[PDB]
């Protein structure tokens, strides 16, 4: 695959790190340049990294459930930072509790996320979606 740069982090007050490690491993092996800002990252850290590294996509991981709060407004800030049209992915365990997935996906897409991933999403799904979206299959 042709090289592209993504930003990868865990948003908000969320300290889960194992998935962040696997995702970095997986997206690196797939040929991506992963700018991994790590856990406990506010929205600004994603945007600052996206700017400095000219990222093609921001992968927001959110495991602890409060991402439904933390994730609101990221797109607007990306627009205001001059990152219009940047890819925004969100996955992990992004709402509190088991919920009806079509409702969750619409909730986060309406926040401005391009793709929304359910619990237990294999990184390979994200990699394939990103290749498609960046048209580098």
């Amino acid at each position: 695959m042709e090289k592209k740069t993504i930003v990868l982090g865990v948003i908000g007050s969320d300290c889960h790190a194992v998935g962040n490690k696997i995702l970095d491993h997986a997206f690196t092996n797939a040929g991506f340049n992963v700018v991994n800002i790590g856990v406990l990252s506010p929205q600004e850290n994603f945007i600052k990294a996206a700017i400095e590294t000219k990222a093609d996509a921001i992968l927001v991981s959110s495991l602890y459930g409060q991402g439904e709060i933390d994730c609101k407004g990221l797109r607007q800030k990306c627009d205001e930072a001059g990152l219009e049209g940047i890819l925004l992915y969100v996955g992990g365990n992004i709402v509190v509790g088991k919920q009806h997935w079509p409702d969750v996906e619409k909730r986060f897409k309406d926040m401005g996320y391009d793709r929304v991933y359910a619990p237990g999403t294999p990184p390979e799904v994200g990699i394939a979606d990103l290749k498609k979206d960046l048209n580098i299959e």
Binding site: G65, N93, V95, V96, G97, K98, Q99, P119, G120
Partner: peptide, 12 residues
Amino acid sequence: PHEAIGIPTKEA
């Protein structure tokens, strides 16, 4: 049994 998904319901 909700461990993989999210904060359990009271029933789970």
